[PDB]
RNA sequence: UUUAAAA
RNA sequence: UAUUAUUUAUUUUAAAA
């Protein structure tokens, strides 16, 4: 119920690895393309990089803060795997190593590292605030899981819209959806994912690497960083041994890819906002006198 | 759909708004599923008891070499005074404890029984404010016309009575006691109390063999 | 009471009737049922419950 | 999905019997054609959104055709839909200083709506009939078609009006409005209506604020208001004969004596005068004799104090009141509401509806005829009415603090209200208020002594060693400063 | 406690330490022979581990039998008192800890040579009594220490330290209060190399300040290193 | 009219992306695969069906869901031409296109519909055809609706979905698969929708055969 | 709880 | 009967002639 990797193929990859040699035809620091496409409702986005597909869905709902921090919304996430990016998944396995851990890193980088804006999230102190969850389904399985899943959740919370309210004194009204246009999430800053997947034979390190790069891996590293040159998390547990002078190349190439991705995603951004916009030219209610 | 809406809270009824025998049932024989099993009902002063007891057994064990055989009982909540799962797995091993001194464990070798007792229904009556040991000698009779029924060996048969929480199980007409079980109570109290339960067995040990010859 | 009745505006209440749409099976409830059929099995909850 | 589906392509109908367009708007029929009439606008240099038009034609008879229209904004805003809704919960149009709320789409506002020269637009005409004393013979209300001549602003009216070699029939037909205005005005101030000043100044954009301008009053501005005020009478007398339970009105309140009661004081104390209370006109009288010799701006401060002193309007429905108290204090009417303006405030689009449904053109809508949605209509609009002033005076008082810091200067004001550790200035070139703390005005605050009897406060002036006693109404000078680590001084 | 003062101008941290000074290291070998075939308790600052390691021993079902190499299974028990507030039980909470879990087996299991013990396994199982900050490179010294009791082989030390970076002063081995109020870089160092086996940013930190943050994360874990290899040498000797 | 696309994710042997409305239903097939211990069955093919919502986790309206995907699939399939094999059919919800809360009829639709395209991209032996679609009835006027919108599920007093086997070309409806009522209907009612339906899975099979053909076509010679 | 007019 | 065995293989000494 595995892959099945033979001697020829391993030694095939890893010997075009030591001639500076990939398989689909990248650079040891070329990111895939990354290509965002928007459903109907908000926070529908799927994100197909290469072979690989993944499909987010953002939602919210009136929920009981934590009392720790009775001024803050929650986020939930969950990163299950089906057969259908692979039969190597078994279905239910909630617990599995790529699934904790894709979690953990968007959880890190979206709700601890203040990505999202959880105290605009609250609605009553210590009683009612914003659940933002974040649905992530893995379509098709050629590597690069996580940092997929990130710009998947990262596209969605800013196309995501929350339904609108009014402060009445000690009352607080919902408007319907269809009555009132919903009010978007707060996003500070946007962080992007990039995994780093090593090789010994004097090391070699490849960025994103496809499904069959990622199983003759001898180590894989992750960084998250956004275009305020800060550095958002880390995760390197185990696999080659690595030194700091490493790390940084590591960051500063990551830099370069994280910097233009974001460009990307704020321009899709705004040319899917403008499809669906075409008489807000009409309704603007703020304008300008003369 | 299931569990319902989290910020439903249950019903609250309040206390101040308005306001020598113990019967038996015995029956045995009327699950298909099983093969054997009870059905014993108790209503004494104002707190009444039926609980249902199937026996799915013997099993074999596919791959086990063990010589004798491995009983499992579990108790498990019906629709009223629901008890917690702690005390209700305690009251398995307790009683797991007792049939594997009566059942013939020798005579199933690579197999096992399970068992399952299910408290309906455990009404209680009392005017103004352990519970469980008042339904330990409903379930030891229960199991035990079961077993029977199920046409497992059961050496002698088995029978238990409660004395202010005292719950003791006796076996051969009372000669030995293969169960014991007290919570709360009081001190010093211990003849009395062998004595109490003893004539409550010998009413039990009866009974069941009044439904298990006829029909 | 989320309602827009208790801003006391014309306008908001206006626009709330126009655009509210018919939702006929939203005025009904149901009942959360928990099925247990004893088959002498141990375990979580079965397909068929 | 209310607007429209023609947007800017939409037309008014060349014939009124024309088939294809009855069949659309049967109510087509129930229209006076009068774009034989030559009306023209007078609005603000560069405005878009023209709720008013006048004309005047001398009749036969010696006596003059003066007619105002208004837009026919009902015929786009119908109730029961969104876009009444949307109106209905802006109230009103809030005017800020660099950007402007809408209560209705621009495509109605500024084109549809908006009674823009030489194109056939709908309007809700007002017809009178006035001899050589501006004494109304006969009033007409009824749904029309106009085409405006020509959309003068105040300066390019009062041009023409002045200019000798232009004399034309739309010429001398702004001659006679003018003639008018001044006699309708004169019978007004005799029957008891006040004369108040307000700070209304208007600042210029490109950074983008560079300095601030007081703006002037031209004949004209009064030849449009008392014309204003005849059509809102006149149409305030109209839909309560009809509809006397639900008729959409404005009332003003009398001010109470404790409202002047600290304004005398000063006066009293300080200038030797009074403001008389007996009746309005007495009031008003009062003030004309309320002058200071060497300031002549002083008079107009008075008149901007006794404001503050004024009661709230309000708008109100007529089943909730009885008609003695339909009074307005201010305007000294016995009736009065808002009509000339439904682009702008959603108090006239309801009494629109209610002037059709008395001519006849159309039903009353039921809203309308409920007491309960009335009463809480006129709730609302009440509160979006103090709102949108209190947000315009706010964004003239912010973006002129932009000014203060950004072109230091010197600016003569006068002192309105002196404490015990602070004095508020009020400016005359801007407008605003200012309050100089003690701290901010003095070295030492704790040899200063503040007299509550004779209002002063005296101190040891800043880079001075000899006490000044500053009284109030008195005319001293401001700067401007930056101390961040805005702030006005006293010179 | 209350508002405290980070790093005092005087460089004085709120505990008494300063920027390069760690916590009282008391480190155990031998605590439990009669349960497990490694022991170490350790007692770093206010924090209370106990690492028990089970093995190299037969596997109890051969469904998790390696023929080339020995298994590693890293079992941590955060137990209820570790902190002040008796923390209850959370579906959210037993996420986190397989995350510490996988990371400490993927740590050791390519510094234990398991090519040595074939068709073997070998069980860590961690109790946590008491935590104050820095708890995950605590685990990791319990750990290697642990294993070399056991007589497992191993390359060299693997050294657990934790760095906090506030505003531009980094601060070694944080406590619980440190954590709360400044982000905080968890390293696993190799022996006296400058290698780094874990490193773990939950935080945001600048990235031109994380050059320095980690030249004096394997400075100061080196000093750990030499703490936990006195310690076997006082308890050779000594036996 | 309807769309659909066929071969679209790489890692499995036939998927197939379904798309109604709103209701968006992406389907992937893997077979004859090993199956497990407790999933082989002696004589023919095994079938793991699997359907995840586009929010939350999989709760048990998916599992009623399964079940009756399940019941469609299953006589569409020769499996005793597989035996002791595995067949995973797994059907992502990507948008609902209907309230989760209320109904269920738009995506139990157009999982069949996905699945069956995603059994013809994989080679599994069918029996047949198949065609799916959801039918409602308005309260006011009494009207059957095929296809129904979001809008009009929320104004109707019964819910229907039909799945019919086509044979022979398209046009011999073999039998009803399945037709799921719930609502308020009578005897009347029932065989005025399932005559009115049987002539709209008939164009839908119709259609569906000329989207299989446009894409397996080129693929072959 | 700032009168009136045009914005 | 370890030069023996495990079949969807728990074998962990298959080397010499």
Redesign the interface.
């Given at each position: 119920?595995d892959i099945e990797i033979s001697a020829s193929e391993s030694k095939f990859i890893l010997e075009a690895l030591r001639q500076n040699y990939r398989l689909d035809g990248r650079s040891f620091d070329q990111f895939r393309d990354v290509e965002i496409t928007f459903?109907?409702?908000f926070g529908?986005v799927?994100v197909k990089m290469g072979?690989t597909?993944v499909?987010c869905?953002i939602?919210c709902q009136i929920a009981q803060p934590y009392e720790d921090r009775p001024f803050e919304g929650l986020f939930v996430i969950?990163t299950?795997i089906?057969?259908?990016?692979?039969?190597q998944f078994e279905?239910g396995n909630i617990?599995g190593?790529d699934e904790?851990?894709c979690?953990?890193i968007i959880e890190?980088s979206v709700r601890?590292?203040?990505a999202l804006d959880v105290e605009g999230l609250c609605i009553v102190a210590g009683s009612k605030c914003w659940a933002v969850?974040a649905?992530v389904?893995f379509?098709?399985?050629?590597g690069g899981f996580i940092d997929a899943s990130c710009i998947a959740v990262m596209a969605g919370l800013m196309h995501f819209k929350k339904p609108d309210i009014?402060v009445?004194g000690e009352?607080?009204?919902?408007?319907?959806v269809?009555?009132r246009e919903p009010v978007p999430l707060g996003i500070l800053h946007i962080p992007i994912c990039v995994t780093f997947s090593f090789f010994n034979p004097s090391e070699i390190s490849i960025i994103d690497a496809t499904?069959k790069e990622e199983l003759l891996r001898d180590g894989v590293?992750t960084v998250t960083?956004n275009k305020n040159?800060?550095?958002?998390?880390?995760?390197?547990?185990?696999?080659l041994?690595?030194?700091?002078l490493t790390?940084?190349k590591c960051?500063?190439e990551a830099?370069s890819i994280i910097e233009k991705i974001t460009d990307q995603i704020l321009q899709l951004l705004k040319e899917d906002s403008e499809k669906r916009n075409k008489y807000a030219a009409?309704?603007?209610?703020?304008?300008?006198?003369? | 759909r299931l569990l319902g809406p989290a910020a439903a809270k249950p019903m609250a009824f309040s206390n101040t708004t308005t306001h020598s025998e113990q019967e038996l049932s015995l029956h045995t024989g009327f699950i298909e599923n099983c093969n054997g099993s009870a059905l014993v009902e108790a209503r004494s002063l104002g707190h009444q008891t039926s609980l249902i007891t199937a026996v799915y057994g013997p099993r074999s064990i596919r791959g086990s070499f063990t010589s004798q055989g491995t009983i499992s009982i579990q108790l498990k909540n019906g629709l009223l005074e629901k008890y917690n799962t702690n005390e209700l797995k305690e009251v398995s091993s307790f009683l797991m404890g007792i049939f594997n001194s009566v059942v013939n464990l020798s005579r199933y070798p690579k197999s096992g029984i399970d068992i399952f007792v299910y408290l309906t229904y455990d009404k209680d009556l009392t005017n103004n404010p352990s519970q469980i040991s008042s339904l330990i000698p409903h379930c030891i009779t229960s199991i035990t016309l079961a077993l029977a029924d199920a046409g497992i060996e059961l050496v002698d048969m088995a029978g238990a009575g409660e004395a202010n929480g005292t719950v003791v199980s006796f076996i051969k007409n009372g000669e030995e006691i293969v169960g014991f079980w007290k919570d709360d109570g009081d001190d010093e109290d211990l003849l009395e109390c062998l004595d109490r339960c003893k004539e409550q067995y010998n009413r039990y040990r009866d009974l069941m063999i009044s439904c298990l010859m006829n029909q | 009471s989320a309602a827009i009745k208790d801003l006391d505006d014309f306008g908001e209440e206006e626009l709330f009737e126009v655009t509210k749409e018919e939702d006929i099976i939203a005025n009904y409830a149901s009942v959360y049922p928990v099925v247990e059929v004893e088959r002498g099995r141990v375990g979580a909850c079965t397909d068929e419950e | 999905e209310c607007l429209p589906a023609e947007g800017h392509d939409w037309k008014a109908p060349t014939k009124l019997d024309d088939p294809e367009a009855v069949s659309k708007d049967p109510l087509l029929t129930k229209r006076k054609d009068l774009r034989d009439k030559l009306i023209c606008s007078i609005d603000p240099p560069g405005c878009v959104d023209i709720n008013d038009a006048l004309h005047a034609k001398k009749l036969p008879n010696g006596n003059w055709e003066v007619g105002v229209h208004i837009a026919d904004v009902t015929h786009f805003v119908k109730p029961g839909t969104a876009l009444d809704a949307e109106g209905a919960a802006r109230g009103t149009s809030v005017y800020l200083v660099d950007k402007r709320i809408d209560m209705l789409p621009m495509l109605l506002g500024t084109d549809l709506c908006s009674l823009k020269p030489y194109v056939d637009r709908f309007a809700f005409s007002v017809i009178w009939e006035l001899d050589d004393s501006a004494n109304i013979v006969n009033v007409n209300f009824m749904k029309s078609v106009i085409r405006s001549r020509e959309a003068f602003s105040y300066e390019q009216a009062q041009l023409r009006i002045d200019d000798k070699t232009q004399n034309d029939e739309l010429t001398m037909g702004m001659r006679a409005l003018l003639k008018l205005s001044v006699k309708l005005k004169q019978k007004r101030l005799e029957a008891g209506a006040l004369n108040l000043a307000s700070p209304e100044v208007k600042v210029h954009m490109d950074s983008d604020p560079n300095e601030v301008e007081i703006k002037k009053l031209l004949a004209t501005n009064s030849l449009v208001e008392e014309f204003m005020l005849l059509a809102n009478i006149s149409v305030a007398r109209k839909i309560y004969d009809a509809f006397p339970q639900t008729a959409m009105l404005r009332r003003h309140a009398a001010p109470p004596s404790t409202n002047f009661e600290i304004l005398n004081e000063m006066l009293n104390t300080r200038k030797n005068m009074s403001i008389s209370l007996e009746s309005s006109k007495a009031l008003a009288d009062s003030l004309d004799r309320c002058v200071d010799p060497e300031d002549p701006y002083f008079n107009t401060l008075v008149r901007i104090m006794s404001t503050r002193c004024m009661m709230a309007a309000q708008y109100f429905y007529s089943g909730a009141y009885s008609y003695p108290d339909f009074r307005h204090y201010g305007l000294a009417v016995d009736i009065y509401t808002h009509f000339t303006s439904p682009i702008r405030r959603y108090c006239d689009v309801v009494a629109h509806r209610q002037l059709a449904g008395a001519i006849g053109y159309e039903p009353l809508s039921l809203t309308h005829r409920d007491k309960n949605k009335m009463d809480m209509i006129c709730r609302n609009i009440n509160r979006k009415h103090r709102n949108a002033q209190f947000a315009g005076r706010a964004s003239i008082e912010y973006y002129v603090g932009q000014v203060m810091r950004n072109n230091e200067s010197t600016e003569t004001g006068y002192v309105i209200k002196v404490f015990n550790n602070g004095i508020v200035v009020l400016v005359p070139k801007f407008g605003v208020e200012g309050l100089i703390r003690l701290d901010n005005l003095t070295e030492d605050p704790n040899s200063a002594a503040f007299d509550e009897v004779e209002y002063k406060l005296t101190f040891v002036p800043t880079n001075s060693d000899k006490p000044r006693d500053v009284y109030v109404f008195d005319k001293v000078e401001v700067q401007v400063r930056s101390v961040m680590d805005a702030e006005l001084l006293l010179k | 406690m209350s508002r405290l003062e980070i790093y005092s101008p005087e460089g004085l941290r709120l505990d008494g330490r300063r920027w390069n000074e760690l916590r009282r290291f008391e480190s155990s070998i031998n605590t439990h022979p009669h349960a497990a075939d490694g022991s170490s308790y350790m007692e770093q600052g206010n924090n209370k581990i106990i690492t028990l390691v089970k093995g190299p021993k037969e596997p109890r079902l051969k469904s998790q039998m390696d023929t080339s190499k020995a298994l590693l299974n890293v079992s941590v028990n955060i137990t209820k008192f570790s902190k002040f507030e008796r923390s209850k039980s959370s579906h959210k909470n037993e996420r986190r800890v397989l995350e510490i879990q996988t990371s400490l087996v993927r740590m050791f299991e390519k510094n234990v040579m398991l090519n040595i013990y074939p068709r073997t396994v070998i069980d860590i199982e961690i109790h946590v009594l008491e935590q104050d900050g820095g708890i995950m490179g605590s685990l990791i010294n319990g750990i290697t220490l642990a294993l070399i009791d056991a007589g497992i082989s191993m390359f060299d030390y693997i050294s657990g330290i934790s760095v906090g970076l506030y505003d531009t002063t980094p601060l070694l081995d944080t406590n619980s209060l440190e954590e709360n109020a400044m982000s905080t870089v968890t390293l696993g160092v190799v022996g006296k190399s400058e290698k780094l086996s874990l490193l773990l940013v939950e935080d945001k930190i600048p990235l031109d300040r994380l050059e320095n943050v980690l030249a004096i994360g394997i400075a100061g874990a080196h000093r750990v290193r030499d703490l936990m290899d006195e310690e076997l040498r006082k308890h050779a000797q000594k036996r | 009219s309807v769309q659909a696309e066929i071969g679209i994710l790489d890692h499995v042997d036939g998927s197939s992306e379904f798309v109604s409305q709103d209701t968006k239903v992406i389907c992937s097939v893997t077979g004859p695969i090993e199956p497990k211990a407790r999933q082989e069955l002696p004589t023919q093919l095994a079938l793991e069906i699997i359907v995840r919502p586009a929010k939350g986790v999989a709760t048990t309206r998916e599992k009623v869901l399964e079940d009756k995907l399940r019941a469609v699939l299953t006589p569409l399939i020769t499996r005793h031409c597989y035996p002791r094999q595995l067949c995973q059919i797994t059907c992502q919800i990507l948008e609902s296109g209907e309230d989760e809360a209320e109904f269920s009829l738009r995506e139990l639709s157009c999982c069949i519909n996905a699945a069956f395209l995603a059994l013809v991209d994989a080679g599994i032996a069918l029996n047949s055809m198949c065609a799916s679609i959801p039918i409602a009835i308005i309260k006011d006027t009494s009207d059957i609706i095929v296809d129904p919108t979001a809008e009009q599920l929320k104004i109707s007093l019964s819910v229907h979905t039909l799945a019919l086997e086509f044979v022979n070309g398209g046009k011999v409806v073999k039998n009803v698969l399945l037709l799921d009522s719930n609502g308020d209907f009578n005897e009347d009612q029932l065989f005025s929708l399932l005559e009115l339906g049987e002539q709209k899975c008939q164009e839908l099979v119709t259609n569906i055969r000329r989207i299989i053909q446009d894409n397996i076509s080129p693929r072959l010679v």
């Open positions: 119920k459903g109907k409702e529908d799927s072979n597909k499909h869905r939602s969950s299950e089906s057969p259908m990016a692979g039969s279905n617990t190593e904790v851990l979690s953990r890190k601890r590292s203040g969850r649905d389904h379509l098709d399985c050629d009014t009445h009352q607080i009204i919902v408007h319907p269809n009555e499904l590293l960083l040159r800060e550095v958002v998390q880390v995760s390197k547990a185990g696999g041994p690595m030194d700091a790390l940084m960051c500063h830099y009409m309704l603007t209610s703020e304008n300008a006198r003369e | - | - | - | - | -």
